[PDB]
Each structure stands twice: as C-alpha cells, then as structure tokens.
Amino acid sequence: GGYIQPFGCMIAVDESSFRIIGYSENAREMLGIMILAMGTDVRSLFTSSSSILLERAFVAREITLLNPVWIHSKNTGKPFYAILHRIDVGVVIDLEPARTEDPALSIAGAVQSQKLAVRAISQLQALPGGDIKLLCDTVVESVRDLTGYDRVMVHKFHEDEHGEVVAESKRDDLEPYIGLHYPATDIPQASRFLFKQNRVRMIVDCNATPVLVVQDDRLTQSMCLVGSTLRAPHGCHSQYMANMGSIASLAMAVIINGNSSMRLWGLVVCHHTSSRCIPFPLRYACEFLMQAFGLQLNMELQLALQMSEKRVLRTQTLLCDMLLRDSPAGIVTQSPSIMDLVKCDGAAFLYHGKYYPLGVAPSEVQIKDVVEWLLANHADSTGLSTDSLGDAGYPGAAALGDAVCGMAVAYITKRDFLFWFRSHTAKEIKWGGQRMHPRSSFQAFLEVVKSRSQPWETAEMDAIHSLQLILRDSFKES
Amino acid sequence: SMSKAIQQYTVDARLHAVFEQSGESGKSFDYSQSLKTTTSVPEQQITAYLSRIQRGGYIQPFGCMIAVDESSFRIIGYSENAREMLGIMPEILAMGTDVRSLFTSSSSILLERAFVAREITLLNPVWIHSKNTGKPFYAILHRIDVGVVIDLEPARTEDPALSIAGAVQSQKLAVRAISQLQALPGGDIKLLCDTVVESVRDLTGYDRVMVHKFHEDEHGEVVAESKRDDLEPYIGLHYPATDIPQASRFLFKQNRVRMIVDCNATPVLVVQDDRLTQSMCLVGSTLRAPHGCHSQYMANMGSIASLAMAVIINGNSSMRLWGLVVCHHTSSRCIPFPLRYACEFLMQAFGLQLNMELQLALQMSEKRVLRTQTLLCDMLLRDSPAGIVTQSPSIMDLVKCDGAAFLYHGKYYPLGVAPSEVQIKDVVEWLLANHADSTGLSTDSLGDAGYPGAAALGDAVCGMAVAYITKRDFLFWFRSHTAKEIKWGGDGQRMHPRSSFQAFLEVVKSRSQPWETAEMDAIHSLQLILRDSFKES
Amino acid sequence: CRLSDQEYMELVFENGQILAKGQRSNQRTKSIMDLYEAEYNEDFMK
C-alpha cells in the first residue's frame, strides 16, 4: 500500500456515497476513537457543520480552491486541518492536528498569512531589476527569517539536470555548502515530476517509524499516493539525510514558463538539526512568496537574454568593421578580438599556413594534427563543435591535457580555420569545503565530468555561423 | 519647481478653495469656468488645504473609531456612532476611561498583547467581541503621533469555520488568477490589462471595473473596461490631470487600497480632547470620509460605491505610480477584509508583469531603432544623399510621426503630411531669425513656440522637430494634433465625465503628443552620422 | 533587511517646499517563528 509519516492521518472515501475504503493505522487512535472499522460513513465521524463543509467540498467540481478545510472532531472536538485531492478512484482526506484551539486566533492567523506574504513580496519588489544573485540572496534571507530553519539554500538545475548551490544562509556553526555541485542521478525524474505537479514537500523527521496504510480487498490497482503530502520518505534519501546530519527538510519549487508548459528551474530547500513541524500560515506565506519569486526570476532571465543578444551583435559588428579596414589578419592584433564574442578560454585562426594563437592555445604542431584529423574525417561539413576532445576519437587527446578539452571549429574553405577552445570544468569550481554524503557526491560529479568542458549554447551557434557567413562573403568579394 | 506636481499643488489648493467658497454661499460649482479661470499662492492657502484634506474629523458611517494613549489605555478620542454601534447605549463611554473595559476579557488581553509590540506585530487585525452584545469586530490598529487609533468594522456573525473557508476561498481565487496571468504569451500589454480587468471583476463582483493609465502630463486614460452590458462605455476616455489632487496620489502610494461604501450617507463627526493642539490625523485610517467634491462627482456620475487600487512599478529604490484600477457599483457595497488583501496580491503580480513588459518593449524599440539606423546608413553609402527619402524604409520609420521633409541646396522632398514649399521657407526663415546657435529644437506645439504662421498652417501639423544637418540644409519631423486619434463614443456646469472630456479637448487643443527623450537621442545620433558623412565629402 | 511594518507619513508645507514628514521618529532580534510562538499562546484560556 504505502507508508506515511507519524504526524497525520489517511482516510480514503468514495466520491458517490461517502463510503470509506481505506484508512491509515494512525487514524483510529489520535482522532479520538477509543467504530471506524471498515465501510462506514465519513460524515458520522465529525459534527454537523463539518459534514456540511465536506459535502460542499465534494460537490464542487474543483477539489482545489477549497483547501484547507477547518473541520472538527466528534469524540473529542479538537480541530483538524484537511486537504483534499482526487485519485480517480475515490476521495482522500489528510488530517493534521492543529495547535491553536482558540477560535479567535484562527482567523487572525489566516489573515496574517496573507499579510506576511504580501509584506515579503513588497520587500522583494524593491530590489533593482539587473541581476539574479541579489534576487536569490534576498529570497533565501526572507525565507529563512519567515521559517526560522537552520540552513536555507537555492539549487539551480543545468541542461544536464545536475544541481548547483548558488545562495546560502546558515547559522555560523556549520560548514558552508555554497558552490557545491552534484550529479543529476541524485534527483530521479519522479521527484522532478512530483515537484512540477505539487510545489511543496516537507519532512518532519527521518528517524520516525513509518505507518502502514490499510487497504481494502475490493481493488487491485493499489493506491496512487503521488498527490499526497503525507507520504513517507524513501529509504535511500532518508539514509542520505541521516548521514548528512539534517533531520527536517522543506523543498519548494521555482517554476518558469518555457518552450506554454512549465519548466523546473530549481529548488529552495531547508535543513534543521532537529525535528520541526512549522504551522500552516507560515507554509502558505512561503508558498505565496515563491510565485512572485518565479515571476521576477523569469523577468530577469528574459532581460539578461536580450542584453546578451545585443552585446553579441555589437561586438560582431565591431569585428566586421575591423575586418573591413586593411587586411583581415588584423582581427587578432587588436583588443576586441575573437575571444570577446563567445565565453571561452582560448581561440585561434589559421590563414595561409600562418597560425595566430589567442589565450590558452596549443602549439602549432597540435593545431596541424587537428587540421589533418578534420580533413581525414569531416571534409564536407561546414562546422564542428564538441565539449570534449576525448571520447570524440582523438588519439592525441592526452597531449593537450586538461587545458584544450572543449572544441568548436568553423571552416573557411578547406584550409583556413576559425578555432575555439575551452578548458575542463574544474578551474571554475572551488568548493573549499562509500558512505552517502555531499562530499562523495561532489567527488562523483568531478569524476563523471572529468575530461569534458561546458556545453556550447545555441546562441553561440548563431554567433559563429553569422561570423562565418560574413567571413565567407569577405573572401568571396576578394 | 519644474516638476508637474509642484505646480499642480497650488492649482489643487485654489480649486479646493473655490469649491468651498461656492459651497458656503449655496451656489453650484462651475467646473469648466473654474478650470479655465486658473492657470502665486501664499503659504496659508496651501497649509489650510493640506490640513483640511488630511485632518477633516469625518468618517464613513459603517465603522467606529476609538483612539487611546499608549501609556494607560486611556481614551483620547472617539466617534459619535461608537456608543450606538457597540450596544453601549441602554458614564461607561466617556473620555478618560479604559479601553479594555469595552470588550470581553479575552479580547482585552489580545488587545493588550497587540499594543505593547515592536517594529512588527503578529496580531493585525484582531478578532474581538463586544462586552455587551458580543458583536464580532475586525479591529485594525495603527499608530499616530499622539496614540493608537483602532478602526472597528462589523463582521458577519456565523461559525468561524465559515469565515476561514471564505478567506481561503478568496486567497485561492487570487492564486488561480495569478496562475492564469502567468500562462500568457508576452510582448503585449493590452491583453494583460484585459485579463487583469476580467479577473478582478470576477473576484470582487462590482458592476464596472476600469484601468486608468497616467501619462507624462499626469492626466489619465482608460484602456480596459468590463461593463455590465446596459452600462454606457467609458473606454478611450481622457480627463484633465487636475481631476486627481496630488494628495490623493500620495495617499494611494501610501496605502494600496481605498473603498467608499456609500456616497449618499451622512458623514460622522469625531470628537477630540481640548489639550490636543490640532485636529486628529486621519491619514492612516481606512474609515476616512471622502471630501465633498469627489462625493458630488460620484453622485452626479451615477456610481454609489467605489473601490480603487494602485499599480506601482519600479522606476530608476523608487516607487512610481503607473495608474489605478477602479471599481464602481450602483448601490451600497462593502466587501469583507480578506478580499482587499487578495486584491493587493493580484495588483502586486500585475505590477511585476507590467515592469517586465515595459522593459522588454523598451529594449525591442531600441533594437529596431538601431537596425533602422544601420539600414539607412547602408542606403546612404550605396547611393546619392537624396535617396534616403525615396525608397522604403525611410526617415518615417525612425520615430513615430505622420510626416517628414529634407532640404538639400533648395531641393525639398515632401513625405506624408507636411507644409508646402512656401511655408517651409517661412519656417526656415523663422528658425534662422530666432534659433541661430543651436544643434536642435523640440517643440510640443508650434503655436506656443511663437510661430506667426502657425494659425495658417492648421491642424494638419502642429508639432515639429528639426535637426541642423548644415547651415542651409535641415531635417524636419512633423506630427498632427492630439485630438486626431482621440475617439470616444460620446454647458459644462455639472461634474460629469463628458465635461471632463470636453475640458481635456479644450486644453490640448492645437497640441501634439510630447517628443520623448528616446526619439530625441535617436534624432541626435542620425544627425551626428549625417554631419560626419557630409563633412567627409 | 527586516519584514517590519508599514509606517505612515503626513504632508506638510515648510520653507516653500513640499515635504513628507514622518509621523513618529529596540529593534527586533528574533525570527518571526519565535514571535508566532510567543504571541499566539493560549495559556490564559486555562
């Protein structure tokens, strides 16, 4: 069936006739019974007003827009927040105890959730719209202040779905984690799908015994507890958190629109040294704040993309104007050069035998070996670009070492070559700080990405192709 | 001083004084005549205007106000209807008493906890019950220079679970509205405004929701509207800037929302203590009664209840009021408390999206201008100088205009709407006579510039911009009057939107849209390029 | 960098210029969760 954390109840009821089909082993005890048994009426377990509220929630075609529901117990009268969701078989209710039994304070907290969220968003909006690091720092500071956890950080997901910490805020007693990288394997695709569907996931503690779910024998499809927020953590990740030292977790997703359908940009995770069950209003305040976070981050991303395109066009036209005057060999002889048009560590140009280095470039013998390779293998192509000389078929790959690993080439006719090098992804990562652990994850990431550079982005393709076409026209005129 | 608000403050004070003078003598306030009369105001007039606007001693008759001191919870002011509202009337409500003796003991403890506080308190508002009849009240606490002011509003008496359900339903509606706003194709503003208007109308439930946009002249315009079928349209309206006193704009920038339950009810006076120097400051209370001018405006127009919310973007930190979204009804309407916060959340999202779209549009416009400039440079290099105006793209594409011309050793090339040869000779003679030592000239209107021939030119062209290519060759840009593209489907004694539109058409008569700085710098760039090219030859 | 609360201001005309003078001229040293725990204490219900 499944397992749930030992701080809430699980009850599954029929949509048509409010007939219970499944219940958690923890429901019969904390709710107030000792009756529940099997095949009874859910409304009989609460008061009349709570029954009316539940019936109204069931009638509504959207299960959402009515959560949470403030219902009361029958045998003891204590409150229980309820969250509803459909599983295409029945209706599932999750009950979590409430610590505020005073009716007067309940509405006060409900309104204060909205007030805190709008105050945090108003604080967020005041920042200038020109960078992303300040945005993430402000967001993590605000979330840490609101939640009062022990460590708050932002994870960013790259093209290869491998994470990276870009912001951090912690009590000055633990080692920092800013700058760490980990492989994409640590995040299965199921977790990404769940985050894209339900934008929250919290863990009270990892040392508690999970509670089995009791199922009915009239069904064969088991139960789809994907939508549940009370599901127990997996064994692997619970062990991971156990070795890490963090016992409580709270992960919320940052979502962008992208080519429309949504895209998971990253996560905001929190860690605590001991168990922490935060009250509901603060949870909703954080949930509301992250929507504005996503909006602003999308705006920043689009603005940065436009500025990058503009700067690329400007440097390309400056290079064109340089090439127009006197010989085309003067491209490499002035400060605005090939290296300034694309993020790279090295570039080169071959022209009538003479070879002009730029940045981290290999010796002329290695250049001519690369050229004879290219004529041997790919002669009818117009360009080539790979992130690793190794694994691409180079027998002389070890000669370069960890300095000329990246690759990008655009031919002129058959002999003149425009060159772009890139080093391995180990000189931009510092991270000064068998058993599953972040250190082992970092070492595994270093091992897997070894002898490889960062992937070339599409905008680099358009830039090099435009420059190449302009160059071809320049020699065609002559 | 050069700012429009600084000049507008004196005009607003003069208009308020004229309205008060007309009212005290029992006449009818003439709108158009008063607007035309004024275009030199002592300190006393401005001081009286501000004091009357902020400290009026009048509240709306749907909520009582009680102000006490922070020291010993001693009452230092209240409203007349407070005695009746609490069920106090059969001294127990007298100045100098203890505010904790009017509510239940638990409510008193909660109020005391909310009083002794810090920069931020976590009980605002509080849910309290009256001592006598147990009526629930939404108590909003804010601090003034002499004490703490408590605004009390009636609350629907029902099960608390129903109140929680209503609050969460409103918040979920706001969240769904934001989510629907997110899933939109970018690059346009009108669609965003229409979606926001429709979502707000669905959320609140008023009879008409409108979006007002403030231009650089500080006047307004409606771009989006959701009527109730039989109501007369108001989209495309333009009204003079003086319809919005700067104090109202500052208040809207201070508190995001402002509601008027009913304009036909009698405002309630507020008593005070003799020891206090000046009247109570009603700038932070949501129960402040509107002034007579706006009440008369809404009564004449037809709206009975109103609700206006502000759209604030980031300007280059600094907050800039882009405009307002307003709601109008035809009866009494008082929305509950949480809906106001949900609306504020929606307005925050709308402002963020508006800032993105504005920045994206600015960048796209700059890119298009640069592309046009390099294309025109290519045409200039390829062919004779006179060819830049012959084949498209041409000078028109550089800036938003309705016509342009080029003079080149006595050769005149007309394009679009433009004066004939004789009028260009007259205008160049005027320029060389008056503006000799200048690299450019931008005029919003030729009549105000001082052109004797402006009247004979007509409404075809009224605004112009000139770049001095040489001492004898000049480049002209022409624009028509503002009223050409102003179109709305619709004796200025009474205060009506028609009178506002007529006054706006009167003031902007024989005037064009202002030449923005972006167009000016693009013109300067092209002028520099042309000067360099012609100096090369 | 604190959440704080909205503070209201009043317009006054002094020295021939518009100024928005503040209304009132021990900072918080605890997280909002601690404030929530301390203030929302229903001990006096007994």
Ligand SMILES: C=CC1=C(C)/C(=C/C2=NC(=C\c3[nH]c(/C=C4\NC(=O)[C@H](C)[C@H]4CC)c(C)c3CCC(=O)O)/C(CCC(=O)O)=C2C)NC1=O
């Ligand atoms: C500092 C390092 C760090 C890492 C590497 C990290 C990984 C991570 N791993 C995550 C999730 C999972 N990661 C896994 C699986 C594994 N994690 C590993 O390290 C293994 C490759 C694998 C188990 C064999 C599972 C099953 C989950 C879902 C857990 C559940 O929802 O019950 C998440 C999402 C949110 C959360 O932490 O609860 C994160 C952020 N979180 C961290 O803080």
Ligand SMILES: C=CC1=C(C)/C(=C/C2=NC(=C\c3[nH]c(/C=C4\NC(=O)[C@H](C)[C@H]4CC)c(C)c3CCC(=O)O)/C(CCC(=O)O)=C2C)NC1=O
């Ligand atoms: C379609 C026409 C239209 C107009 C011209 C219009 C003007 C307007 N006038 C507005 C406000 C005010 N306008 C005034 C003053 C005046 N209005 C005029 O027409 C007079 C020139 C002047 C009377 C002193 C005042 C004092 C207010 C603030 C009232 C208060 O809140 O106590 C507002 C914002 C507040 C609201 O709408 O509740 C608006 C939007 N609203 C409309 O719908």
